[PDB]
Amino acid sequence: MWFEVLPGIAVMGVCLFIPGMATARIHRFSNGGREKRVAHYSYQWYLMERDRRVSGVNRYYVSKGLENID
Amino acid sequence: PGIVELPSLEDLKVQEVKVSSSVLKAAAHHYGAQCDKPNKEFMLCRWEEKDPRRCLEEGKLVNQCALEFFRQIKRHCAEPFTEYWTCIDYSGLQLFRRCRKEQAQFDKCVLDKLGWVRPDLGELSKVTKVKTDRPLPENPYHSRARPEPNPEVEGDLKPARHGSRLFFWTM
Ligand SMILES: CCCCCCCCCCCCCCCCCC(=O)OC[C@H](COP(=O)([O-])OC[C@H](O)COP(=O)([O-])OC[C@H](COC(=O)CCCCCCCCCCCCCCCCC)OC(=O)CCCCCCCCCCCCCCCCC)OC(=O)CCCCCCCCCCCCCCCCC
Numbered sequence: 001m002w003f004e005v006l007p008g009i010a011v012m013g014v015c016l017f018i019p020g021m022a023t024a025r026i027h028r029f030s031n032g033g034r035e036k037r038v039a040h041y042s043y044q045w046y047l048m049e050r051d052r053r054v055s056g057v058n059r060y061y062v063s064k065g066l067e068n069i070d
Numbered sequence: 071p072g073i074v075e076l077p078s079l080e081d082l083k084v085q086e087v088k089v090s091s092s093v094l095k096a097a098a099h100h101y102g103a104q105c106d107k108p109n110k111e112f113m114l115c116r117w118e119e120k121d122p123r124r125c126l127e128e129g130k131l132v133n134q135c136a137l138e139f140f141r142q143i144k145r146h147c148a149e150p151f152t153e154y155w156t157c158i159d160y161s162g163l164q165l166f167r168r169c170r171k172e173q174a175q176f177d178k179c180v181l182d183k184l185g186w187v188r189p190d191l192g193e194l195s196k197v198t199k200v201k202t203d204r205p206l207p208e209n210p211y212h213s214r215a216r217p218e219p220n221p222e223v224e225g226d227l228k229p230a231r232h233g234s235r236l237f238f239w240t241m
Contacts, residue, residue: 047091
């Protein structure tokens with residue numbers, strides 16, 4: 001009856017779940033298991049470029065804590 | 071014109087604060103509390119000299135006082151701070167609001183073991199007064215002598231000599 005639209009709606013819902021889940025897993029994979037750094041403002045970008053400079057491996061996401069200093 | 075005068079490469083060598091931005095943002099309020107005085111001496115020197123080359127030594131004091139800020143965290147409260155900057159480091163916009171329990175643990179461990187009060191909402195944006203012994207720069211714009219202005223008008227205004235003197239008009 002009416003519930004035969006539910007396979008098509010379910011397949012459409014899976015096909016809409018794929019982009020958001022995909023970009024979340026890609027942001028966690030390309031950034032060391034964390035969110036993607038949002039730089040809307042130039043201060044956030046300056047901190048991100050500082051992280052890229054202080055990581056030593058030319059990657060902003062590799063974080064260095066108190067173990068880097070003595 | 072003249073040779074620009076830059077400091078040498080050995081003049082700029084200092085032990086940098088080699089930590090990430092989330093490590094800095096996690097320790098930011100206690101850094102603004104405890105490392106107040108050389109930071110404000112430096113930023114006062116920086117807005118008064120208007121020249122970074124005349125601000126290096128005070129800047130080194132900043133890089134002297136930040137590291138002693140972190141070692142005193144590293145000697146006492148390394149692990150709650152490590153968990154706290156890790157939780158700050160997870161987020162994209164690096165929200166303080168997503169990490170309040172690690173913040174409470176870090177503030178409790180710091181207030182117990184070191185006796186630092188975290189600054190409240192409104193304190194770190196204050197304009198503070200700084201006691202320095204360096205002289206006030208008498209010409210921070212490297213300006214020169216302003217030209218002499220034109221002489222003003224003075225004296226009582228007498229009538230026009232013989233009127234308008236326009237070809238034949240006697241008034
Ligand atoms: C107790 C307290 C109270 C006491 C009160 C006592 C007084 C009571 C009366 C007060 C009221 C004022 C009365 C007049 C005062 C004397 C003015 C005078 O004669 O100046 C001589 C003036 C200069 O002569 P001056 O020998 O060197 O000095 C004698 C005075 O001491 C000149 O003295 P100044 O050095 O002080 O004069 C200053 C300067 C002296 O002048 C100059 O520096 C020389 C240059 C003046 C202008 C030249 C312009 C040239 C190109 C344009 C020409 C336009 C066309 C000509 C006219 C066509 C007709 C419309 O004049 C001006 O800058 C003003 C311009 C001229 C206007 C004169 C006054 C006219 C009033 C009545 C208007 C009627 C129409 C007049 C004609 C219209 C055109 C003006 O003569 C001329 O410029 C030639 C034109 C004649 C003047 C106007 C005549 C006035 C009487 C008209 C009666 C008939 C009207 C008929 C109907 C209308 C016409 C169709």
